[PDB]
Structures are given as structure tokens and as C-alpha cells.
Amino acid sequence: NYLHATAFQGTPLAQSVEGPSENVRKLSRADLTEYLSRHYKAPRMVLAAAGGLEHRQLLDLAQKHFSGLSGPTLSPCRFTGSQICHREDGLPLAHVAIAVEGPGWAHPDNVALQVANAIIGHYDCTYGGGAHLSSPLASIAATNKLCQSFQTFNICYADTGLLGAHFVCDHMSIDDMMFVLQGQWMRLCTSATESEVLRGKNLLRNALVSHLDGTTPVCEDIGRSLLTYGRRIPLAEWESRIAEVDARVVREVCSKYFYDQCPAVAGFGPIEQLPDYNRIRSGMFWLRF
Amino acid sequence: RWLEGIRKWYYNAAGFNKLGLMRDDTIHENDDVKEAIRRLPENLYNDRVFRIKRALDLSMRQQILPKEQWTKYEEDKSYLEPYLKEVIRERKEREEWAK
Amino acid sequence: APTLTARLYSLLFRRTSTFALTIVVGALFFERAFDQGADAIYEHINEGKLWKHIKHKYE
Amino acid sequence: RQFGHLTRVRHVITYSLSPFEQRAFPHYFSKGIPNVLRRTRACILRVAPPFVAFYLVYTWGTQEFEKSKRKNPA
Amino acid sequence: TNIRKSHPLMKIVNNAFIDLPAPSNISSWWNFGSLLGICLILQILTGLFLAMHYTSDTTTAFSSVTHICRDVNYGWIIRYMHANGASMFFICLYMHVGRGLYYGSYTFLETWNIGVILLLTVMATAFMGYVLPWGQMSFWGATVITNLLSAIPYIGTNLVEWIWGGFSVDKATLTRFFAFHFILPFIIMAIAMVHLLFLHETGSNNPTGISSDVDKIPFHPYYTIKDILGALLLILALMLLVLFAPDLLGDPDNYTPANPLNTPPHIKPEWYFLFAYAILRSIPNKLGGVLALAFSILILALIPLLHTSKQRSMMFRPLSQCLFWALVADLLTLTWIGGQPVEHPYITIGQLASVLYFLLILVLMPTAGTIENKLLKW
Ligand code: HEM
Ligand code: HEM
Numbered sequence: 059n060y061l062h063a064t065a066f067q068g069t070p071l072a073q074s075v076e077g078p079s080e081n082v083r084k085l086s087r088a089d090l091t092e093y094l095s096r097h098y099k100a101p102r103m104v105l106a107a108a109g110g111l112e113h114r115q116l117l118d119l120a121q122k123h124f125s126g127l128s129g130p131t132l133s134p135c136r137f138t139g140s141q142i143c144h145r146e147d148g149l150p151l152a153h154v155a156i157a158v159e160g161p162g163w164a165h166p167d168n169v170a171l172q173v174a175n176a177i178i179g180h181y182d183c184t185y186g187g188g189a190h191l192s193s194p195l196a197s198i199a200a201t202n203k204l205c206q207s208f209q210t211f212n213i214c215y216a217d218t219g220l221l222g223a224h225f226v227c228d229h230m231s232i233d234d235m236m237f238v239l240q241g242q243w244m245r246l247c248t249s250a251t252e253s254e255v256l257r258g259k260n261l262l263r264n265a266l267v268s269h270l271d272g273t274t275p276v277c278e279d280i281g282r283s284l285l286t287y288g289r290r291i292p293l294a295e296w297e298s299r300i301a302e303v304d305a306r307v308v309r310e311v312c313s314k315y316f317y318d319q320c321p322a323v324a325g326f327g328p329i330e331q332l333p334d335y336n337r338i339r340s341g342m343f344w345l346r347f
Numbered sequence: 348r349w350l351e352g353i354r355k356w357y358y359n360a361a362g363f364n365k366l367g368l369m370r371d372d373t374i375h376e377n378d379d380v381k382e383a384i385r386r387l388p389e390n391l392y393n394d395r396v397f398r399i400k401r402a403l404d405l406s407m408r409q410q411i412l413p414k415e416q417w418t419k420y421e422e423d424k425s426y427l428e429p430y431l432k433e434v435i436r437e438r439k440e441r442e443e444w445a446k
Numbered sequence: 447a448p449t450l451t452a453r454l455y456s457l458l459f460r461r462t463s464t465f466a467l468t469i470v471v472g473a474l475f476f477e478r479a480f481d482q483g484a485d486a487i488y489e490h491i492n493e494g495k496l497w498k499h500i501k502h503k504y505e
Numbered sequence: 506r507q508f509g510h511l512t513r514v515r516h517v518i519t520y521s522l523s524p525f526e527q528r529a530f531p532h533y534f535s536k537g538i539p540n541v542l543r544r545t546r547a548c549i550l551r552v553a554p555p556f557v558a559f560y561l562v563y564t565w566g567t568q569e570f571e572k573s574k575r576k577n578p579a
Numbered sequence: 580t581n582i583r584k585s586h587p588l589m590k591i592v593n594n595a596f597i598d599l600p601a602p603s604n605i606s607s608w609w610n611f612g613s614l615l616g617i618c619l620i621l622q623i624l625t626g627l628f629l630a631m632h633y634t635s636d637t638t639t640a641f642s643s644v645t646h647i648c649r650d651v652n653y654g655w656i657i658r659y660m661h662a663n664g665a666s667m668f669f670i671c672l673y674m675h676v677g678r679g680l681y682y683g684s685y686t687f688l689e690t691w692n693i694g695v696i697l698l699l700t701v702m703a704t705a706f707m708g709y710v711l712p713w714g715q716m717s718f719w720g721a722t723v724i725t726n727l728l729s730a731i732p733y734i735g736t737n738l739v740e741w742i743w744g745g746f747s748v749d750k751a752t753l754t755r756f757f758a759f760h761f762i763l764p765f766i767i768m769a770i771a772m773v774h775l776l777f778l779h780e781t782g783s784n785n786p787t788g789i790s791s792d793v794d795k796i797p798f799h800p801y802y803t804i805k806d807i808l809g810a811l812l813l814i815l816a817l818m819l820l821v822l823f824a825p826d827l828l829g830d831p832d833n834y835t836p837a838n839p840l841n842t843p844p845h846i847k848p849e850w851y852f853l854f855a856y857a858i859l860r861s862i863p864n865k866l867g868g869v870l871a872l873a874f875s876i877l878i879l880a881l882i883p884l885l886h887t888s889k890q891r892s893m894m895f896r897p898l899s900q901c902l903f904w905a906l907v908a909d910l911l912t913l914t915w916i917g918g919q920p921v922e923h924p925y926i927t928i929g930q931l932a933s934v935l936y937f938l939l940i941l942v943l944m945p946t947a948g949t950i951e952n953k954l955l956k957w
């Protein structure tokens with residue numbers, strides 16, 4: 059919530075989904091019904107279904123019950139290189155979330171960025187891999203007990219997004235976590251290898267093929283893809299976009315979004331060590347490439 | 348009593364109030380004060396922490412608060428006195444016992 | 447076309463390798479330019495006072 | 506003592522901007538000039554009076570040395 | 580983990596230079612430490628380059644210094660950088676000490692006392708440096724100042740002749756003054772490192788005199804960039820002297836060679852000793868005058884013990900502020916008076932200024948602290 063609030067400050071994307079307590083306490087039924095009739099409209103809606111069914115039948119059922127449905131453009135959102143630091147030493151572990159401005163739903167670069175995010179991957183203290191883990195960030199984090207957990211993300215919104223990582227660590231490890239994480243970003247930008255990109259590809263191939271298991275995730279993929287892309291993108295098309303990515307692509311794509319760019323930083327808890335913004339920002343380039 | 352005129356004058360001349368500090372924030376931390384600080388309850392300590400943070404940040408910018416925001420002479424509670432008094436009173440007892 | 451500062455960034459200042467080569471090229475061109483330019487300013491300020499200006503009288 | 510072992514702080518938020526998002530000299534004359542005058546007025550009659558005194562004891566003593574070296578009408 | 584925190588050499592650099600936690604709010608008065616370092620390194624380089632051309636033999640000495648300025652390539656710019664660099668050093672020193680006094684940094688006892696030692700070492704270095712050109716003021720300055728030690732009962736007279744290595748300031752004195760003057764800066768560099776070693780035990784004081792642990796910033800980039808700016812301004816001041824007024828802070832009489840007969844009109848040390856030279860001349864008795872000149876510097880060691888105020892810095896202390904600025908103005912008066920001939924009204928002004936110096940440090944500023952306390956119900 060803090061990451062968004064600082065990243066997309068002074069816009070509607072800075073806003074939390076739940077709203078401030080002030081609004082919750084005051085919102086009348088007039089507000090709710092006005093909100094509904096403005097936003098809940100047939101062209102801004104999709105009826106999705108998956109399982110044992112004839113498509114023809116669904117469409118006719120849609121006629122029967124959703125015919126009464128009636129028939130507000132989003133402004134772009136300004137990303138800001140910023141920091142929000144809620145220092146609270148009373149809490150036992152520190153949460154840090156860092157991201158650069160991502161491309162947003164439509165953009166093809168998202169596929170290559172997913173491949174890169176798969177390389178770096180994710181970790182927590184219950185993972186079987188440890189030192190022998192393929193991700194250098196994970197293996198270093200595991201062997202030196204830098205963090206309790208981390209993940210890379212790439213959050214997509216309409217014309218923008220949040221591309222980065224979140225980690226949870228010991229109060230003495232925040233600087234080291236940042237250093238290794240930012241080090242990974244730089245290594246992929248400058249010098250990603252063919253075999254590790256192949257690994258990332260394979261992770262991503264496997265990721266989205268096995269996520270779409272059973273009817274609920276498939277129904278949701280239908281529902282949301284129609285909103286974001288305007289269509290469901292078939293698995294064969296995803297595969298074509300993935301096979302297109304090589305080491306050269308990962309470099310070029312990562313350098314676009316990561317290299318020499320101002321990130322948004324959010325920190326919460328015992329964050330005394332959490333690096334100064336200037337040091338973080340200087341950690342977004344190498345003096346060699 | 349009669350010097351209360353001068354005390355009030357000196358207070359504003361000294362000017363720590365312009366950074367939103369109370370007098371006991373400006374006390375130089377010796378061993379007794381350290382112990383007194385260490386004994387403060389969560390609320391009084393975190394206030395101290397913030398007031399100083401605020402003052403240091405203002406000092407960094409070479410600026411002061413708005414005059415409305417300045418610590419009023421009358422509203423300057425002596426927050427550290429009960430803790431510090433006893434810390435000192437205790438040490439003097441140990442120093443006595445040692446002789 | 448994007449702005450001039452932006453063209454400078456993408457061509458010269460993005461890769462730290464090009465950033466350094468830029469500095470070394472620029473330093474050469476600045477040195478000669480600055481020296482020649484500042485000497486002119488000095489010698490105009492001291493017109494006819496210097497050996498350089500009165501050299502011709504004894505050659 | 507390392508960063509992360511300095512002291513205990515609770516419930517203090519710090520918002521800040523990237524130096525690439527902002528100006529190096531925001532309201533440099535607009536707010537700078539009046540803040541300088543405020544700073545100068547604040548310290549002037551602590552700082553200045555002794556140097557006034559120096560200037561006076563200096564210029565007094567200088568031309569006192571001159572008068573003393575002249576011959577007296579006697 | 581990184582190889583800044585790991586490597587045995589980089590570890591010391593990373594902790595004392597880059598990731599050093601520094602208070603957010605330290606002012607321009609904190610730049611003077613870095614500038615003292617630059618001064619010291621500047622003196623060592625320029626000095627070493629001069630020593631490649633100088634000779635400590637009494638006959639050739641004056642000639643060698645001038646040979647540097649006329650025949651040696653850019654020897655002039657090196658020579659005058661070194662002479663004005665010595666001035667820049669002392670400017671930096673007194674500003675650095677003033678900061679310590681005003682903001683009460685002297686409570687860091689070990690750091691402070693090592694400081695006193697450093698001050699005394701730089702003084703010893705610069706006194707012996709000024710002798711090396713072997714001009715009039717060089718020779719006569721050295722003669723009068725050294726010979727003050729003869730005022731010690733029983734031993735004093737021997738002591739003076741033992742420093743000299745003869746019965747006057749002559750051949751053996753100049754040669755040894757060159758050797759001591761060469762070695763001492765290196766001893767300074769060592770003691771300066773111990774100075775910081777103790778400073779990094781506590782970290783820095785700040786203008787408020789209130790602890791800054793709640794708001795530390797890393798030294799890099801914040802103070803690396805400020806120190807660069809400071810360095811730049813130091814170079815400007817230095818080069819403004821070197822290239823526009825290289826003779827301004829010296830004396831003309833040091834452009835005629837040393838003559839053991841012909842005494843200069845008003846013999847005096849270089850400007851940065853003048854305050855203490857005035858204190859010496861205040862006391863009518865010679866041994867008294869020497870013990871006062873010695874106590875005018877050593878009293879720095881006594882400052883921490885004289886501290887009375889419950890607040891550390893003078894920031895929140897109007898009375899002390901005035902008394903401090905009085906003490907500065909008084910020192911400016913002693914410097915002026917030090918430069919004057921011994922006559923009316925400079926004798927009486929000098930006496931009155933010297934009284935006020937010790938009065939301010941030993942009585943008035945301590946009293947002012949306690950008055951301030953009782954004004955705050957403390
Ligand atoms: C060659 C001489 C000296 C060098 C190279 C030197 C170096 C330094 C440096 C680099 C610092 C840290 C930066 C700063 O705050 O300025 C410092 C701090 C300090 N020095 Fe010096 N110093 C010297 C002489 C002295 C003298 C003569 C004194 C006192 C008589 C002194 C007392 C201090 C004190 C008290 C501090 C701590 C300041 C603070 O934290 O507020 N030093 N010194
Ligand atoms: C704290 C460090 C130093 C100070 C304060 C200092 C000070 C001085 C001063 C005041 C002079 C007389 C300058 C003049 O009137 O011409 C001088 C001369 C000299 N110094 Fe240094 N010095 C220092 C370090 C060094 C070092 C490290 C060396 C050699 C390795 C050196 C070598 C010389 C030489 C050869 C001269 C005679 C040339 C000349 O007169 O400029 N000095 N020094």
C-alpha cells in the first residue's frame with residue numbers, strides 16, 4: 059500500500075483499495091448507488107465461464123438475465139522516484155518493497171520481464187534448495203541468511219505498473235539484501251547468459267501452464283484477459299513470445315526499465331539499516347558497462 | 348518570583364522552542380541522563396525521539412517552525428525531572444555506601 | 447525529436463564506458479579552447495605591455 | 506556503531522523525492538533571501554558587538570599612537 | 580555481502596569514510612577537519628618538492644630558496660603555495676578549534692586532547708619552517724623565541740644552547756631545524772589518524788549539542804560531496820593568495836638574508852603566533868611572560884574541566900554566545916597588538932586584552948554557564 063502511495067503519488071493509483079477510515083465511516087448509500095451506475099456498465103463488464111458447458115448456452119443465459127445492464131476514462135499515472143519510510147523498531151522483522159515503473163498490461167516487453175523476474179525468482183526460509191538454488195540471489199540469501207523471504211513481482215496496471223521485488227529480513231540485513239538484489243538487476247541488464255535465460259523461459263512456460271489448472275483460475279484468466287488485453291491470449295501464443303526471448307532480449311528489455319532509473323522504495327518496521335535513497339539510486343547503475 | 352521576567356526573556360532568547368523542543372530535550376547526555384532516558388515510558392520516550400528528529404531536521408535546513416508551533420514557556424513540562432532526580436539520588440547513595 | 451539533454455544522455459551518458467570516453471575527448475577540446483580563449487583575454491588586457499607584443503621591434 | 510545499531514525509534518514516517526524528480530534550487534532567492542535575513546537578525550547582536558568594540562579600540566589606539574609621536578606645543 | 584566490508588584494507592575505508600553514520604545537520608564548521616587533512620597533504624607534497632631543491636647549509640640556504648623561485652620550473656608556485664598553505668593551515672586550525680569551543684565538541688576528551696597535541700605539533704613545525712629561508716625575520720624570530728627558554732631557573736641557559744647546538748642560532752641550528760621540520764609532518768599524520776580513531780568511537784557532535792543517533796545519514800554521498808565543495812573553496816582561498824597576493828600574509832624583512840649584527844625594526848613571528856606573542860609581552864617579568872605564553876595554548880586542555888552548562892552547545896545559550904564572540908574579538912585584538920611596537924597605547928591595550936583572554940576562559944564563561952542554568956531552573 060505504501061509502495062503504490064509513494065510510486066503513484068498525487069493520482070488515483072496512490073489510493074488504497076479499501077479507502078481511508080474517514081471515507082468508510084461517512085460513505086452514504088447515495089454514494090454507493092451513484093458509484094455503481096457510473097462504473098458497472100455492460101461494455102466495462104465480462105461474463106466468463108469455464109468447465110462443462112456449451113458456449114451457446116452461456117450466451118443465451120446472459121441474454122436472459124444480463125440484458126438490463128446499461129451502456130469515465132482513466133488518466134495516465136505519473137510515477138515518482140520516491141521513498142516512504144515508516145520506521146517502527148518495535149516490530150521484529152523489516153519489510154522492504156522496491157520497484158521501477160513497469161510498462162503496463164498491453165506491452166509485449168512484459169513477457170521478457172517475466173523471464174527476467176523468473177531468473178531472479180523468489181525464496182523463503184522453508185525452501186528445499188538452499189545453496190544449490192539456481193537463482194544467485196536465492197543461493198546467496200539462503201547461505202548467508204540475509205532474508206527470511208523475497209519475491210520479484212512485475213505488477214501491471216493500464217498505462218503503467220510496479221516492477222521490482224519485496225523482501226522480509228533481519229534488521230541487520232537490509233543493506234546486504236538491497237545490494238545483492240540491485241546487483242542482480244544490474245547483472246541481467248549488462249550480462250545475462252543464454253542458459254540462465256533458457257531457465258527463466260522454462261520457469262515461465264511452466265508457471266503459466268500449471269497455474270491454469272481447474273476451472274476457477276481458467277475462468278478468471280478469461281474474465282480479466284478480456285478486460286486487460288481485449289482477448290484471451292492462447293497458450294500457444296504465450297509460448298511463441300517466450301521462445302522469441304534470448305539473452306540479448308533480456309539484457310535490452312531489463313536495461314530499459316531497470317538500468318539508471320529512479321525506483322520507488324517502501325520500508326516498514328526496524329528499518330534503520332534500509333539504505334539512503336541516493337545510495338539505492340546509485341545502485342541502479344554500474345561504473346563499467 | 349521577580350526574576351520570572353528574565354526567565355521568560357531568556358527562554359525565548361535561548362530559542363530551542365523555535366525548533367519545537369522542550370528544555371529536557373536540550374540536556375547534554377551524561378551517564379545519569381542516559382539512565383533517566385532509558386527509564387522513560389514508551390509515550391514520553393517516542394515524543395522525545397520525534398521532537399529531536401524534528402529539531403535536527405530543522406537545524407539541517409537552517410530554518411525554524413512557525414511561531415504558533417513554538418514551545419510556549421508556560422507549556423514546557425519538565426518531563427525528565429522525576430526520572431533524573433531519582434537516578435542521581437540513587438548514585439549518591441552508592442557513592443556514600445562506598446565510603 | 448526528444449530534447450537536447452536527452453540526446454546527450456542516450457548517446458553519451460548512459461553507458462559509463464561512453465561517459466568516460468566523452469569526458470576524455472571533452473577535456474582535450476576544453477583544454478585547447480579554454481587556454482587559447484583565456485590567453486586572448488589576458489593579452490588584450492595587457493596590449494603592448496608584453497614581450498610577445500614588443501618582440502617585432504628587435505627582429 | 507553500524508547503521509541498524511544506533512538507537513530505537515518508533516512511529517516516524519519519512520517521505521522523500523528522487524533527486525532526478527526535483528530541482529536543485531527550489532525558490533532559491535524567493536525563500537532564501539528572507540531566511541538569510543532572519544538568520545542574520547537572530548545572531549547580529551551576539552556576533553557584531555565585540556567586533557564593533559575591536560574596530561573602536563583599534564582605530565582609537567592607531568591614531569593615539571600617531572598623536573603621541575607628534576611634538577607637543579611646549 | 581560486498582568486498583567493501585570484507586577486505587581488511589577496504590573495511591577500514593568503508594567504516595571510517597563511506598558508511599560512516601554522520602549527523603544529518605552538521606554545518607560548515609565541520610568541513611575544517613577535512614580541510615586540515617588537505618592542508619597537511621598539501622604541505623607534505625609541496626614541501627617534499629621544495630626539499631628536492633633546498634639546502635640547510637647557512638651560506639647556501641637563502642640562495643637555494645630564491646633559486647627555487649627563479650630557476651626551478653614552477654618552483655615559485657610551489658614555494659608560495661607552501662608558504663600560504665601554512666597560513667591556510669592555521670586559518671583552518673583556529674576555525675576548527677572555535678567550532679569545538681562553541682559547540683562543546685571538547686567533551687570528546689581524547690579526541691580533544693589529541694587535538695591539543697596536533698595543534699602544538701603544527702605550531703612546532705611552522706615555527707621551524709619559517710626559519711628555513713634564513714632571512715632576517717627567520718633568524719631574529721628564531722633567536723628571540725628560542726632564547727625565552729633561558730628564563731627557566733638552573734637549566735634554562737644550557738637548554739637553549741643545546742637546542743641551538745652552539746652559542747647562537749647558527750649552522751647546526753638550521754640543519755637540525757630542517758631535519759625536525761621534515762619529520763614532524765609525518766608524526767602529525769600519525770597523531771591525526773589516532774585523532775580520528777577516537778572520534779569514530781563516538782561519532783560526530785552537531786550544532787544542536789543534542790544527540791543525533793535518531794537522524795544519521797551515511798557519509799557518502801552527503802558529506803563526500805560537501806567536503807569536495809569545501810576543498811574547492813580552500814583551493815580558491817589558497818590560490819587567491821598565491822596568484823594575486825603571495826606576500827600579503829608574510830613580512831618583507833624576510834627578503835633580505837639573515838644578518839647576526841643588523842637587527843630588523845620590529846621583530847615578530849608569523850601572524851598565527853601574534854596573539855600569544857602579545858600575551859608574552861603583557862607580563863613585565865620574562866619567566867612570567869614565558870609561562871603565560873605557554874599557558875595561553877595549554878589552557879585548551881583545561882577547557883573541558885571548566886564546562887558548567889547543562890546544555891552542551893552554545894546554540895541555546897545567548898550569554899555564552901556573546902562571551903564567545905568577545906573571546907574571538909579579543910584574540911583578533913591580541914593579533915593586532917602582537918604586530919605593534921612596544922609603546923603607548925599598545926602596551927596597555929595588550930595588557931587589558933591578555934587579562935580579558937584568561938578572564939573570559941577561566942571566570943566569565945564558566946559563570947555565564949551557571950547563570951544560564953539558573954535561568955532555566957537547572
Ligand atoms: C592537523 C590537525 C587536525 C586534523 C587533521 C584534524 C582532523 C579532524 C577531522 C578530519 C575531524 C572530523 C571532521 C570535523 O568535524 O571537522 C576532526 C574532528 C575534531 N577535531 Fe580535529 N583535527 C586537527 C586538529 C584539532 C585540534 C587542534 C583540535 C582541538 C584543540 C581538534 C579537535 C577536534 C574535535 C573536538 C573534533 C570533533 C568535532 C565534532 O564532532 O563536532 N582537532 N578533526
Ligand atoms: C604542517 C606541515 C608543514 C608546515 C606548517 C610547514 C610550514 C612551513 C613554512 C611556514 C615555511 C616557510 C615558508 C616560507 O616563508 O618560504 C616552510 C618552509 C619549508 N618547508 Fe615546510 N611545512 C610543512 C611541511 C613540510 C614538509 C613535509 C617538508 C618536506 C618534506 C617541508 C619542507 C619545507 C622546505 C624545504 C622549506 C623551505 C622552502 C621554503 O621556504 O618555502 N615542509 N614550511
Ligand SMILES: CCCCCCCCCCCCO[C@@H]1O[C@H](CO)[C@@H](O[C@H]2O[C@H](CO)[C@@H](O)[C@H](O)[C@H]2O)[C@H](O)[C@H]1O
Binds near residue numbers: 863927
Ligand atoms: C588625563 C586623562 C587621561 C585619560 C586618557 C589616557 C591616555 C593618556 C596618557 C596617560 C598615561 C597612560 O598610561 C600609560 O600606560 C602604560 C601601560 O600601563 C604605560 O606603560 C608602563 O606601565 C606598565 C605598568 O604595568 C609597565 O609594565 C610598563 O613597563 C611601562 O612601560 C605607559 O608608559 C603609560 O603612558
Ligand SMILES: CC1=NC2=C(CCCC2)C(=O)C1c1ccc(Oc2ccc(OC(F)(F)F)cc2)cc1
Binds near residue numbers: 595
Ligand atoms: C574521517 C571523517 N570523519 C568524519 C567527518 C565529518 C562527519 C563525521 C566524522 C569527515 O569529514 C571525515 C573526513 C576526513 C578527512 C577527509 O579527507 C582526508 C584528508 C586527509 C587525510 O589524511 C590524514 F590521515 F588525515 F592525514 C585523509 C582524509 C575526508 C573526510
